[PDB]
Amino acid sequence: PAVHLSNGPGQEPIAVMTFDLTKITKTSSSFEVRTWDPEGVIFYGDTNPKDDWFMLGLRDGRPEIQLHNHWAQLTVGAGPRLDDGRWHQVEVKMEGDSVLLEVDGEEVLRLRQVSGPLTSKRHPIMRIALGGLLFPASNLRLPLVPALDGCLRRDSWLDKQAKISASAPTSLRSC
Amino acid sequence: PAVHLSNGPGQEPIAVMTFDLTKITKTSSSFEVRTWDPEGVIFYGDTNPKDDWFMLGLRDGRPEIQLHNHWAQLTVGAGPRLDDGRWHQVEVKMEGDSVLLEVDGEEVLRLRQVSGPLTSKRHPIMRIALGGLLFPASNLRLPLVPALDGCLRRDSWLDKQAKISASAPTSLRSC
Ligand SMILES: C[C@]12CC[C@@H]3c4ccc(O)cc4CC[C@H]3[C@@H]1CC[C@@H]2O
Numbered sequence: 267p268a269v270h271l272s273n274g275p276g277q278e279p280i281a282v283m284t285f286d287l288t289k290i291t292k293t294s295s296s297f298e299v300r301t302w303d304p305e306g307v308i309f310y311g312d313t314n315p316k317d318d319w320f321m322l323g324l325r326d327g328r329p330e331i332q333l334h335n336h337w338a339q340l341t342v343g344a345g346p347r348l349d350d351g352r353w354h355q356v357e358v359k360m361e362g363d364s365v366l367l368e369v370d371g372e373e374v375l376r377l378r379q380v381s382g383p384l385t386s387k388r389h390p391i392m393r394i395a396l397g398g399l400l401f402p403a404s405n406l407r408l409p410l411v412p413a414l415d416g417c418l419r420r421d422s423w424l425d426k427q428a429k430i431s432a433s434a435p436t437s438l439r440s441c
Numbered sequence: 442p443a444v445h446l447s448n449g450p451g452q453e454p455i456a457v458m459t460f461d462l463t464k465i466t467k468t469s470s471s472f473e474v475r476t477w478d479p480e481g482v483i484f485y486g487d488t489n490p491k492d493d494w495f496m497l498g499l500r501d502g503r504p505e506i507q508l509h510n511h512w513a514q515l516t517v518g519a520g521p522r523l524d525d526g527r528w529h530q531v532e533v534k535m536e537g538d539s540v541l542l543e544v545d546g547e548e549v550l551r552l553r554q555v556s557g558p559l560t561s562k563r564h565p566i567m568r569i570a571l572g573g574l575l576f577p578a579s580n581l582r583l584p585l586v587p588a589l590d591g592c593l594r595r596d597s598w599l600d601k602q603a604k605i606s607a608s609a610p611t612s613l614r615s616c
Pocket residue numbers: 293294295310311312313318319320333334335358359360365380381392394423424
């Protein structure tokens with residue numbers, strides 16, 4: 267079962283989850299995505315939308331990560347185009363001080379020395395938003411148009427042990 | 442004709458070129474590299490080894506860029522392993538405010554918003570060192586052992602119009 271990553275004209279995420287970082291052990295997430303859209307947000311995460319935030323999206327068909335925290339601030343593209351209408355496996359892992367991006371079983375990007383441990387963030391509540399940002403797109407380091415006309419399936423985010431809340435799936439729309 | 446990227450035990454580059462940035466028009470370089478070595482420096486560049494420097498190397502077989510300037514400071518891995526004993530084409534381009542890395546005809550990395558124009562650097566003299574750094578390896582954001590047991594060929598760096606000086610090829614060693 268797959269869900270649409272955008273619902274209608276709005277830019278809002280289709281879903282938000284929140285996690286207690288004092289209870290994280292697994293610091294990775296995995297999902298499959300399918301789209302013909304070259305630009306948009308796949309997911310956004312933060313502990314503070316002003317001071318500690320992360321965005322995985324597509325620009326010109328390829329993955330783009332933007333992140334802004336006390337240790338690093340960056341806008342980076344990598345990997346193959348994904349806007350070919352095929353399902354693609356994506357894994358985004360925090361390992362040590364690094365963020366790893368794997369696409370279709372291949373590591374395509376490693377941002378080294380970019381974060382302290384999730385355990386120790388100043389604010390111990392992490393949000394993950396699917397298909398949109400939790401601030402205006404103009405707040406990005408490099409704006410894009412967030413709407414991603416795509417589908418998401420087989421998605422797991424950190425683990426249930428850490429999860430405090432998840433948005434109502436009443437609004438989710440099947441693909 | 443190919444040359445070795447390391448000569449004996451020392452860490453020093455095998456060659457240094459310097460350029461007048463007031464005369465650059467082409468801001469890209471291209472070469473082929475072949476190695477079985479998973480770690481080392483391919484080339485280093487700077488306008489100031491303290492304040493504005495760039496390194497392309499291999500770590501765990503894959504490209505790594507480190508760069509430190511007024512606008513960005515980063516350590517990033519991307520692309521496939523290159524330590525498979527095959528010749529690989531590499532192109533490193535500055536385009537707008539971005540650095541592009543292309544391997545075997547595929548863009549594998551785009552560092553966006555990382556530099557002002559080469560035209561306008563505070564110091565208008567750029568050095569490019571092949572096979573080594575122009576400071577101690579401990580000065581890197583993330584140290585590696587610089588010696589790269591590999592070969593380089595078909596290399597062009599910016600253009601001759603901009604070049605002020607090039608090291609004596611008396612020390613270069615053929616592969
Ligand atoms: C933990 C994840 C990778 C690392 C991400 C990160 C990494 C650094 C940072 O300062 C904030 C965030 C928030 C979102 C995190 C992501 C949410 C899911 C993904 O697996």
